[PDB]
Design a protein around this ligand. Structure first.
Ligand SMILES: CC(=O)c1cccc(NC(=O)C(F)(F)F)c1
Ligand SMILES: [Cl-]
Ligand SMILES: [Cl-]
Ligand SMILES: [Cl-]
Ligand SMILES: [Cl-]
Ligand SMILES: [Cl-]
Ligand SMILES: [Mg+2]
Length: 348
């Protein structure tokens, strides 16, 4: 067991191993507080997250276990990984606090799309890396659920990592009105007309790629209905074959009130774009989620010819998510989490 030391930073006690020095506050959502630190064992600048109220309810205890399981699994160049996890507790009986350690990220994709002149080569490389990471995530039967520019870290060498997996955390208030939290979400889930499946992540990639080509949000709706009307104007209203698959009475009832509209000409929307970029956008931004391109198919599209290497696009080890259907008490979720903290092995 390492030696721990204590300090108070913005009204919070931080108890951490001596290896972590120069702690300075960076941020605090409702899920926890974050400090930047220098890790003297590895020489990395790191983010240290202290979870808030991790075992306050069954819902919260299960979310803690979910997050730790996911971060322990993810071992890929284009996905955030776990550098360390610790607790100051010396036994399960005194266990209350969980701290998560990752590489410190600087710029996100929001920063670079607002500010920098992107060539077609920059768009090819950034979207390639998102799809390489998504091939690996989807091979584990994990859905990200929250891909958007603020969840994509990018360094000065245009190298990209996916972070901030959806832990089923977003509220109705957070999705209301003129908000980036909704602009990247697939229609069939905006009002929960379809059960979630991995195809919703490819919709989000299409929205992100469009915004790197134009510098503008693709579907900046003022509310869920405004956003659906912007989507259907571009991709067309549902056809007969994609009404036959829509089981939700709520969906067919609103959908069938709208005047029918054809799919627009994407070369006239994305004026001047690489024709191969236009073609790939037409294959992602399809209303019928069964007919969307997959991450593995998209890596083999001609748009990525300069970067595609089918011997360097790895898949994940199998991921057991059977806990998601299991009914346990708070202390049972807490013991499972404790076990996962003590069994952690750091990366090479
Ligand atoms: C199976 C499938 O692709 C599916 C299932 C339910 C709803 C929708 N989409 C829509 O209802 C909307 F796009 F018009 F919003 C699509
Ligand atoms: Cl230490
Ligand atoms: Cl990482
Ligand atoms: Cl503790
Ligand atoms: Cl964003
Ligand atoms: Cl597993
Ligand atoms: Mg985020």
């Amino acid at each position: 067991r390492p030696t721990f030391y204590r300090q108070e930073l913005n009204k919070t006690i931080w108890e951490v191993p001596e290896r972590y020095q120069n702690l300075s506050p960076v941020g605090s959502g409702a899920y926890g507080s974050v400090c930047a630190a220098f890790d003297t064992k590895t020489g990395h600048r790191v983010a240290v997250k202290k979870l808030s109220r991790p075992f306050q309810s069954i819902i919260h205890a299960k979310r803690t276990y979910r997050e730790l399981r996911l971060l322990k699994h993810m071992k890929h160049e284009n996905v955030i990984g776990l550098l360390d996890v610790f607790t100051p507790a010396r036994s399960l009986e005194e266990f209350n606090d969980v701290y998560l350690v990752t590489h410190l990220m600087g710029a996100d994709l929001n920063n670079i799309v607002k500010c920098q002149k992107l060539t077609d080569d920059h768009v090819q490389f950034l979207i390639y890396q998102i799809l390489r990471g998504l091939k690996y995530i989807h091979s584990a039967d994990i859905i990200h659920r929250d891909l958007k520019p603020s969840n994509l870290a990018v360094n000065e060498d245009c190298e990209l990592k996916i972070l901030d997996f959806g832990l089923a955390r977003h509220t109705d208030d957070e999705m209301t009105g003129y908000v980036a939290t909704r602009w990247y979400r697939a229609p069939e889930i905006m009002l929960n007309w379809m059960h979630y499946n991995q195809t919703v992540d490819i919709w989000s990639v299409g929205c992100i790629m469009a915004e790197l080509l134009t510098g503008r949000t693709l579907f900046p709706g003022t509310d869920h209905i405004d956003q659906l009307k912007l989507i259907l104007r571009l991709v067309g209203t549902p056809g007969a074959e994609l009404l036959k698959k829509i089981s939700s009475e709520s969906a067919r009832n609103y959908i069938q009130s709208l005047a029918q509209m054809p799919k627009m000409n994407f070369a006239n929307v994305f004026i001047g774009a690489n024709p191969l970029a236009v073609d790939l956008l037409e294959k992602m931004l399809v209303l019928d989620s069964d007919k969307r391109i997959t991450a593995a198919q998209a890596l083999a599209h001609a748009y990525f010819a300069q970067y595609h290497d089918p011997d360097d696009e790895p898949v994940a080890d199998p991921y057991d998510q059977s806990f998601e259907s299991r009914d346990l008490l708070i202390d049972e979720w807490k013991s499972l989490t404790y076990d996962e903290v003590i069994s952690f092995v750091p990366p090479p």
